[PDB]
Structures are given as C-alpha cells and as structure tokens.
Design a protein around this ligand. Structure first.
Ligand SMILES: CCCc1cc(OC2CCNCC2)c2nc(Nc3ccc4cn[nH]c4c3)ncc2c1
Length: 253
C-alpha cells in the first residue's frame, strides 16, 4: 500500500483496448506523466484476483518488463497504473504499415530484447505462461517489454502452449521457451497467426502426432534452427533464455 494513489491524480483520455473484464486507457498522472490504466469492470472478475497481477508486478522489475507505477483500489472501478508504451503491442506494430517497413535485423533485435526479459524471469524462478506478441509492448524508442502477467506464477493461449503443459498441466520456464519459438514465428511473419488455417483443437491433435511448423519463406535457416531448438518435444532439451539471448545477439553481427 505504498503503491496506492488518489483517484484524483489520474485522468483518462483514450481507450486502448476493451475486454470483458474491462478496458485499458491511456491517461496522465498529475497531468505530467502519461500512463496506461487497466480498468476492472466489477462483477466480471473479483477484485482480489484482478489485483494479483499488480501484486506480482511489485515483485518483478526489469527494463524489458512493463513497469508498475501505482494502483487505485478504494472506489468502484479499480485501476492498475503502468508505464505507457507508444506503439502498443508488438503485434499491432508489426501489422501496422511502419512495422512492414522494418526488416530482419530489427526483428532479431526485438527477438533478443524479449529473450532478455525472459532471462530475468528464469533467473527469478518465475513463468509467464502467456508469452506471445500480443503481450509484448513497443515504445516510441522501439524497445520491447513483456506486458501482461495475468497468468504468470512463481485462459491459456493454446497455440503458444507447450505439449507437456497442454497434456499434463506441466507449465515451467521450458514451456515459456516453447512459446518463445512460437513468438519468433509471429515476429518473422510480421504478425501472422501460428498454425495458419487451423483450430486450437486441430493443433492439440497435430502436436500429439509430432507436428511442427515448417520454415517460413523469409526466416533464415539459422534462425529457424533457434525456433526448432525451442520446440523440442522433451522440455529438458530446450535451451535457456540466457542461451537464446546470446545466439540472438550474435546472429545480429
Ligand atoms: C500489465 C500491463 C498492462 C497494460 C495493458 C495495455 O493494454 C494493451 C494490451 C495489448 N493489446 C492492446 C492494449 C497497455 N497498453 C499500452 N499502450 C498501447 C496499447 C495499444 C495501442 C494501440 N495503438 N497504440 C497503443 C498503445 N501501454 C501499456 C499497457 C499496459
């Protein structure tokens, strides 16, 4: 409760997204600092549960993770206040015309930035569980930060979820690596959806047969190798994020 602040020192301006659990707004703190405000629509979700995301964020702080600044909990609609990212999700950015212009070099940069943030998560013995392009935000400076920690721990995105997780509820840091490989596919394709023209049900079935997404026309052999490292059936045999950052950094040069 040192993160509590008066509702008066927050003005909402533009709505960014609208979910069933509420909305997200760009706003200002004390008229000076622009911020993002996550709104809890009461009824759809319990207060205590909605806040556990923020509670988790007090613990986790890193430059590749979206920083919590404050919260508003005393009155009817509840706010969570974070740093604002000018370009929205990595998915919004890549799909936008500006992101279309961006070419492989920077895509690798984005890749590595994310691996770095995740290397922090593994260092700190956590798991994200919902790691994908929609939950990575982008600043005006073109920096990437991991945003939504709703499912993070000390509904699940089926097409980003590892086979052992789906089959045995076994979510671990290695499951997040799987997801990262899938994130790579999102990046290299400029925001396209994984397993194109397939249902979640299809994918679950296909993964039991040992399916893996074949290489994309763009994706270089040596990057595809990195993706394929992440997608090894046995979780133990997948790399660490530390290692992924390295190889992604050295690919650059
Ligand atoms: C735990 C983190 C909570 C959170 C949640 C957000 O909501 C977004 C989630 C991903 N989908 C869209 C909403 C945030 N959005 C932004 N900026 C933002 C968002 C969307 C757009 C579109 N054009 N420009 C944009 C700028 N900045 C910080 C955010 C923080």
């Amino acid at each position: 409760s040192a993160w509590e602040i008066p509702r008066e020192s927050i003005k909402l301006v533009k709505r960014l997204g609208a979910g069933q659990f509420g909305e997200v707004w760009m706003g200002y703190y004390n008229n000076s600092t622009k911020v993002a405000v996550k709104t809890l629509k009461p009824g759809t979700m319990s207060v205590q549960a909605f806040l556990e995301e923020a509670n988790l964020m007090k613990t986790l702080q890193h430059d590749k993770l979206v920083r919590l600044y404050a919260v508003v909990t005393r009155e009817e609609p509840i706010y969570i206040i974070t740093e604002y990212m000018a370009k929205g999700s990595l998915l919004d950015f890549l799909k936008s015309d500006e992101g279309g212009k961006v070419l492989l070099p920077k895509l690798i940069d984005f890749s590595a930035q994310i691996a770095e943030g995740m290397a922090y998560i593994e260092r700190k013995n956590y798991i994200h569980r919902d790691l994908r392009a929609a939950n990575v935000l982008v600043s005006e400076s073109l920096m990437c930060k991991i945003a939504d920690f709703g499912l993070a721990r000390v509904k699940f995105p089926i097409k980003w979820t590892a086979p052992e997780a789906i089959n045995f509820g076994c979510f671990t840091i290695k499951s997040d690596v799987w997801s990262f490989g899938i994130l790579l596919y999102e990046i290299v394709t400029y925001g396209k959806i994984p397993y194109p023209g397939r249902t979640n049900a299809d994918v679950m079935t296909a993964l039991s047969q040992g399916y893996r997404m074949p290489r994309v026309e763009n994706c270089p052999d040596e990057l595809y190798d990195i993706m394929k490292m992440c997608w090894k059936e046995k979780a133990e045999e997948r790399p660490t994020f530390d290692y992924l950052q390295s190889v992604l950094d050295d690919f650059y040069t």
